[PDB]
Amino acid sequence: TFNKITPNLAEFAFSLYRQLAHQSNSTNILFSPVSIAAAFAMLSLGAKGDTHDEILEGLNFNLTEIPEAQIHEGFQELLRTLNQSQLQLTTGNGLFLSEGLKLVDKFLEDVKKLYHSEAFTVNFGDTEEAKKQINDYVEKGTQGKIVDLVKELDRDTVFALVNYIFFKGKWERPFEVKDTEEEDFHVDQVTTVKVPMMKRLGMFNIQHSKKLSSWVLLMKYLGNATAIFFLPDEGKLQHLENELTHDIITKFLENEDRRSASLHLPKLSITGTYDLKSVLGQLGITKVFSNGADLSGVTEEAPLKLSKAVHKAVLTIDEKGTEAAGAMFLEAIPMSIPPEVKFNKPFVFLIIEQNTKAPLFMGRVVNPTQ
């Protein structure tokens, strides 16, 4: 029912998330476990030795157990599913290599075949123009959604990696725009701010979890994906974050039971931008960014390290995700008081690709206006 690497990606998702959440309980979090992991597993094709092994271990692959071919086969199938589609996910990874380097052909080939990805040569002698060309690539690829991604380069940069994802999904069962109104969002136990709040009375895949002390909502998107939202009980955000597991999430995803509920969900447009050298360094991925990097799969003659690595994720949630008329359907709603479930205080979510079950996004909203 799942890709061989899905459990690893879930662990990586939680490792990275918990790292961000450990530092700050006031920040929104948004990133793609999948896009980041695929960017580094792609990179590992050009790496050898400890350089190579740290990357894959830092992505939660135990190399004593999982053969490398299974890793790359895993990613190749997952990325194929994302490029095939009503989902209209946009994800891209660009490698930007000094045009003075003699590049190994097999690497350029592998980056194409396995990772459906792009390698470019640039003149890092002109720092500003290199930055422009990198940022124009990302801008072009996001049809303008992501601008000025890279703000600066080290003067000694010879290799940069930029990884982006943008998604605005379309609910299978959408909200009515007429019902969206400004509501309070409880940023803390004594403070609110106003946000646009969508609402619907409907038959939802929704339940309360005593294990997680949270409400758990699953909503399907058109195309191959599902959003799962977790609404912690009062004072239980940290508990929620600590108790998530792959096996718990999998059991939610397996449940198809629906019950009536009055759902309030904010209309969101949120982003996360991360320096991957910093964030993956804390996960143990260090050598590839250091002078001792073994990237002889990329270039044989010359020293090479990854100078710059950036991720940016953008997610939009709204009523429909499209101007198009939806498929018409009727839900039978019982004559009984539905629970009111309001995503009007900090919550956690994941977005899951349905064929593979892989975690396309993981995030937290603590303030929709940050």
From Swiss-Prot:
UniProt record, GO biological process: acute-phase response; blood coagulation
A UniProt-annotated Pfam family: Serpin
Glycosylation positions in this chain: N25, N62, N224
Tissues in which the protein is found: Ubiquitous. Expressed in leukocytes and plasma.
Effect of G92S: In QO-Newport
The organism's place on the tree of life at top rank: Eukaryota
Record's subunit section: Interacts with CELA2A. Interacts with ERGIC3 and LMAN1/ERGIC53. Interacts with PRSS1/trypsin. Interacts with PRSS1/Trypsin. The variants S and Z interact with CANX and PDIA3.
Region (RCL): 321-345
Entry function: Inhibitor of serine proteases. Its primary target is elastase, but it also has a moderate affinity for plasmin and thrombin. Irreversibly inhibits trypsin, chymotrypsin and plasminogen activator. The aberrant form inhibits insulin-induced NO synthesis in platelets, decreases coagulation time and has proteolytic activity against insulin and plasmin.
Disease link: Alpha-1-antitrypsin deficiency: A disorder whose most common manifestation is emphysema, which becomes evident by the third to fourth decade. A less common manifestation of the deficiency is liver disease, which occurs in children and adults, and may result in cirrhosis and liver failure. Environmental factors, particularly cigarette smoking, greatly increase the risk of emphysema at an earlier age.
Modified residue annotations for S-cysteinyl cysteine: S209
The keyword Transport appears for this protein: no
Protein name: Alpha-1-antitrypsin
Record remark on domains: The reactive center loop (RCL) extends out from the body of the protein and directs binding to the target protease. The protease cleaves the serpin at the reactive site within the RCL, establishing a covalent linkage between the carboxyl group of the serpin reactive site and the serine hydroxyl of the protease. The resulting inactive serpin-protease complex is highly stable.
Site annotation (Microbial infection) Cleavage: residues: K305, L306, S307, K308
Keyword hit for Endoplasmic reticulum: yes
Location in or out of the cell: Secreted; Endoplasmic reticulum
Family per record: Belongs to the serpin family.
GO terms assigned for molecular function: identical protein binding; protease binding; serine-type endopeptidase inhibitor activity
Outcome after substituting Q133E: In L-Frankfurt
